Design an enzyme around this catalytic site. Structure first.
Site, PDB file in Angstrom:
ATOM      1  N   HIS A  18      35.717  47.199  43.529  1.00 57.44           N
ATOM      2  CA  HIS A  18      35.135  45.698  43.058  1.00 57.44           C
ATOM      3  C   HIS A  18      36.566  44.988  43.092  1.00 57.44           C
ATOM      4  O   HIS A  18      37.679  45.509  42.254  1.00 57.44           O
ATOM      5  CB  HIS A  18      34.697  45.465  41.852  1.00 57.44           C
ATOM      6  CG  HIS A  18      34.166  46.492  41.301  1.00 57.44           C
ATOM      7  ND1 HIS A  18      34.013  47.647  40.330  1.00 57.44           N
ATOM      8  CD2 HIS A  18      32.666  46.607  41.162  1.00 57.44           C
ATOM      9  CE1 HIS A  18      33.214  47.816  40.395  1.00 57.44           C
ATOM     10  NE2 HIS A  18      31.957  47.325  41.289  1.00 57.44           N
ATOM     11  N   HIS A  54      39.490  42.989  40.759  1.00 54.95           N
ATOM     12  CA  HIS A  54      38.929  42.670  38.884  1.00 54.95           C
ATOM     13  C   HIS A  54      39.345  41.260  38.991  1.00 54.95           C
ATOM     14  O   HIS A  54      40.647  40.795  39.201  1.00 54.95           O
ATOM     15  CB  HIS A  54      39.420  43.901  38.788  1.00 54.95           C
ATOM     16  CG  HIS A  54      38.309  45.156  38.166  1.00 54.95           C
ATOM     17  ND1 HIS A  54      38.258  45.723  37.505  1.00 54.95           N
ATOM     18  CD2 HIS A  54      37.754  45.645  39.177  1.00 54.95           C
ATOM     19  CE1 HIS A  54      37.329  46.887  36.787  1.00 54.95           C
ATOM     20  NE2 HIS A  54      37.202  46.848  38.489  1.00 54.95           N
ATOM     21  N   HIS A  63      35.485  43.261  36.136  1.00 58.93           N
ATOM     22  CA  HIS A  63      35.632  42.081  37.688  1.00 58.93           C
ATOM     23  C   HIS A  63      35.779  40.472  37.834  1.00 58.93           C
ATOM     24  O   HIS A  63      35.176  40.065  36.861  1.00 58.93           O
ATOM     25  CB  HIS A  63      34.210  42.324  37.642  1.00 58.93           C
ATOM     26  CG  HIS A  63      33.532  44.220  38.252  1.00 58.93           C
ATOM     27  ND1 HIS A  63      32.181  44.442  37.838  1.00 58.93           N
ATOM     28  CD2 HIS A  63      34.485  45.029  37.606  1.00 58.93           C
ATOM     29  CE1 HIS A  63      32.388  45.914  37.745  1.00 58.93           C
ATOM     30  NE2 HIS A  63      33.145  46.260  37.853  1.00 58.93           N
ATOM     31  N   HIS A 119      26.892  41.213  36.281  1.00 58.16           N
ATOM     32  CA  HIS A 119      26.921  42.213  37.364  1.00 58.16           C
ATOM     33  C   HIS A 119      25.744  42.602  38.631  1.00 58.16           C
ATOM     34  O   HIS A 119      24.461  42.580  37.710  1.00 58.16           O
ATOM     35  CB  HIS A 119      28.028  44.050  37.210  1.00 58.16           C
ATOM     36  CG  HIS A 119      28.084  44.339  37.758  1.00 58.16           C
ATOM     37  ND1 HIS A 119      29.132  44.149  38.556  1.00 58.16           N
ATOM     38  CD2 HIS A 119      27.591  45.510  38.541  1.00 58.16           C
ATOM     39  CE1 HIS A 119      29.072  44.829  39.661  1.00 58.16           C
ATOM     40  NE2 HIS A 119      27.924  46.276  40.054  1.00 58.16           N
ATOM     41  N   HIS A 163      29.058  39.413  40.687  1.00 55.42           N
ATOM     42  CA  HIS A 163      30.478  38.985  39.914  1.00 55.42           C
ATOM     43  C   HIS A 163      30.301  38.612  41.503  1.00 55.42           C
ATOM     44  O   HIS A 163      30.217  38.943  42.325  1.00 55.42           O
ATOM     45  CB  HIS A 163      30.975  39.869  39.467  1.00 55.42           C
ATOM     46  CG  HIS A 163      30.465  40.130  38.345  1.00 55.42           C
ATOM     47  ND1 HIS A 163      30.810  41.643  37.561  1.00 55.42           N
ATOM     48  CD2 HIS A 163      29.636  39.716  36.942  1.00 55.42           C
ATOM     49  CE1 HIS A 163      30.240  41.675  36.022  1.00 55.42           C
ATOM     50  NE2 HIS A 163      29.658  40.680  35.915  1.00 55.42           N
ATOM     51  N   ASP A 218      32.333  41.527  42.662  1.00 56.72           N
ATOM     52  CA  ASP A 218      31.076  42.918  43.513  1.00 56.72           C
ATOM     53  C   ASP A 218      31.730  43.427  44.611  1.00 56.72           C
ATOM     54  O   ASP A 218      30.331  42.288  45.509  1.00 56.72           O
ATOM     55  CB  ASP A 218      29.789  42.386  42.506  1.00 56.72           C
ATOM     56  CG  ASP A 218      29.910  42.501  41.244  1.00 56.72           C
ATOM     57  OD1 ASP A 218      30.949  43.108  40.220  1.00 56.72           O
ATOM     58  OD2 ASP A 218      29.057  42.268  40.414  1.00 56.72           O
ATOM     59  N   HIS A 271      36.658  53.193  42.063  1.00 52.20           N
ATOM     60  CA  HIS A 271      35.984  53.749  40.882  1.00 52.20           C
ATOM     61  C   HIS A 271      36.152  55.213  41.007  1.00 52.20           C
ATOM     62  O   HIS A 271      35.627  55.825  42.071  1.00 52.20           O
ATOM     63  CB  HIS A 271      35.051  53.002  40.200  1.00 52.20           C
ATOM     64  CG  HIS A 271      35.290  52.165  39.263  1.00 52.20           C
ATOM     65  ND1 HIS A 271      35.220  51.632  38.127  1.00 52.20           N
ATOM     66  CD2 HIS A 271      35.564  50.868  40.182  1.00 52.20           C
ATOM     67  CE1 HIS A 271      35.394  50.221  37.994  1.00 52.20           C
ATOM     68  NE2 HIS A 271      35.930  50.410  39.261  1.00 52.20           N
ATOM     69  N   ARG A 277      38.670  54.136  36.695  1.00 55.91           N
ATOM     70  CA  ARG A 277      38.947  53.146  38.039  1.00 55.91           C
ATOM     71  C   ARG A 277      40.436  55.095  38.178  1.00 55.91           C
ATOM     72  O   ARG A 277      41.216  54.742  37.746  1.00 55.91           O
ATOM     73  CB  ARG A 277      40.002  52.909  37.516  1.00 55.91           C
ATOM     74  CG  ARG A 277      39.127  51.198  36.625  1.00 55.91           C
ATOM     75  CD  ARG A 277      39.741  50.147  35.833  1.00 55.91           C
ATOM     76  NE  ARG A 277      38.842  49.197  34.898  1.00 55.91           N
ATOM     77  CZ  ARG A 277      38.683  48.085  34.845  1.00 55.91           C
ATOM     78  NH1 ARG A 277      40.621  47.578  34.842  1.00 55.91           N
ATOM     79  NH2 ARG A 277      38.209  47.551  33.941  1.00 55.91           N
TER      80      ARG A 277
HETATM   81 CU   LIG Z   1      36.334  47.870  39.235  1.00 51.19          CU
HETATM   82 ZN   LIG Z   2      30.362  43.055  38.647  1.00 51.64          ZN
END
Ligand SMILES: [Cu+]
Ligand SMILES: [Zn+2]
Ligand SMILES: [Cu+]
Ligand SMILES: [Zn+2]
Lengths: 146, 149
Positions: free
Chosen positions: B43, B45, B60, B68, B77, B80, B117, B140
């Site tokens: 994602h 952020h 995000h 999300h 988002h 995403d 992630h 992360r």
């Molecule tokens: Cu993320």
């Molecule tokens: Zn998200």
């Protein structure tokens, strides 16, 4: 009221954090460690490509290299930062040419600290008009929204 | 317009992701090595702040204030992206196209952080609170600020 931050890192031991806060001047401050005692070139470069890939000094107007107070300078020409015996450079400056908005926006560009002092375009050779003869890029970081 | 991001973390995970784009789709591609085989959350952020590693990147990127979701879901988002896939060698060769993000305008991601992630993103289809927020992608592993190229 925008804010930005850059984390500086490189192949050597140099590391730091530089904050930016702003038609108002941009306040720039932070700390850089791992530097040899002395003056060190400090500029915003063209590409936010994390340090050889950062490109030349940020130069949207295609100008020659200069010092921060010169009318002729690259938008990215901030000043030499000073590192003490302990290798730490406490940075606190105000710059009128860079900005966090508009044509001179530096968000997404790279901040680079150099091995040697920047001659601010007054060296007497062609390179001075390009890089200030500041030497190797010791560490860099992409300027991000904080 | 082109952008690039160098992903790094505390461990073996590192990569390079390129972005290339109006309202036209943004092509995202590159490779990420050092990943455990399988799926990994991916994602953009909100913040391009790496002062606390990837932890300070914020949640995000969500300019439209939505829940999300997966990249192809109605509600998601802006940041995403789909899970990236690491092969047996631990390499994820990414090639995605997204029409929600942008390298210009409002949903501009330049200056923001790209994060990869530890676990798979559940796309908000999970059985808990956090699913609607992070997809339970876990920690992360690596990140980097998206820069101009
Ligand atoms: Cu993320
Ligand atoms: Zn998200
Ligand atoms: Cu420089
Ligand atoms: Zn310059």
């Amino acid at each position: 009221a925008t804010k930005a931050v850059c984390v500086l890192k490189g192949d050597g031991p140099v590391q730091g954090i530089i904050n930016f806060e702003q038609n108002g001047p941009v306040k720039v401050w932070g700390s850089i460690k791992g530097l040899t005692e002395g003056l060190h070139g400090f500029h915003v470069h063209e590409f936010g490509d994390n340090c050889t890939s950062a490109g030349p000094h940020f130069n949207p107007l295609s100008r020659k290299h200069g010092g921060p107070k010169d009318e002729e300078r690259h938008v990215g020409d901030l000043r030499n930062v000073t590192a003490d015996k302990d290798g730490v450079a406490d940075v606190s400056i105000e710059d009128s040419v860079i900005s966090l908005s508009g044509d001179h926006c530096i968000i997404g560009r790279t901040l680079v600290v150099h091995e040697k002092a920047d001659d601010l375009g007054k060296g007497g050779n062609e390179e001075s008009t390009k890089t200030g003869n500041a030497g190797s890029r010791l560490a860099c970081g992409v300027i991000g929204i904080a």
